[PDB]
Amino acid sequence: PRRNIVGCRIQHGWKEGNGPVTQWKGTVLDQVPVNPSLYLIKYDGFDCVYGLELNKDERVSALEVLPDRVATSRISDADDADRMIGKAVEHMFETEDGSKDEWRGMVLARAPVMNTWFYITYEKDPVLYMYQLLDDYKEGDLRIMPDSVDSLVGKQVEYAKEDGSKRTGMVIHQVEAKPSVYFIKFDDDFHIYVYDLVKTSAENLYFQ
């Protein structure tokens, strides 16, 4: 029968530590070709994209996949998304105590399935996020800055931490609009880590 759940809405119990089991609901965005057990999900209420092995993870229970696949809507703003994809940006967020908070970042791609959302990462938090950036732009909260042989996708990666331990993981994606930028999935966490190999922030990070 049908085994591709990309595009489905899912629901499942989640158990954090020894706390109670709570329900999470979200949309499956992708299934990683170099690791078909790994799915990327946008959960309702979490800004970060999660990487979970939905059928194996010990913190997941009572998983249900709805057959009703989320349809991709008509794209009518490719003229403006093309000026933003692959660029450095300054994204404005509202703080609780008053206002104003600018975060420097980079727009990576239009998100798959939920295609009015974009993938973005920040210098202060270098993991994968999803926001409806063209709406934020219209509201005056996004500034777009002008710019000045073996494939690494699928390779194992590790980097030494300050306490002497090695953090293991795998490269799962190469950013089409900025090919020196990669997505890394580490064994110990569900966030997706974004690295630009041209920068000093990715020199400690080393391959095999």
UniProtKB/Swiss-Prot annotation:
Q: Which family does it belong to?
A: Belongs to the SPIN/STSY family.
Q: Where is this region: Histone H3K4me3 and H3R8me2a binding?
A: 45-50, 94, 189-191
Identify the species of origin. Answer: Homo sapiens
What is annotated about its quaternary structure and interactions?
A: Homodimer; may form higher-order oligomers. Interacts with TCF7L2/TCF4; the interaction is direct. Interacts with HABP4 and SERBP1. Interacts with SPINDOC; SPINDOC stabilizes SPIN1 and enhances its association with bivalent H3K4me3K9me3 mark. Interacts with SPOCD1; promoting recruitment of PIWIL4 and SPOCD1 to transposons.
Using the record's annotations, give every residue carrying the modification Phosphoserine: S61, S76
Modification note: Phosphorylated during oocyte meiotic maturation.
Q: What is this protein called?
A: Spindlin-1
Identify the segment of the full-length protein shown. 49 to 262 of 262
Q: Where is this region: Tudor-like domain 1?
A: 5-68
Q: What does this protein do?
A: Chromatin reader that specifically recognizes and binds histone H3 both trimethylated at 'Lys-4' and 'Lys-9' (H3K4me3K9me3) and is involved in piRNA-mediated retrotransposon silencing during spermatogenesis.
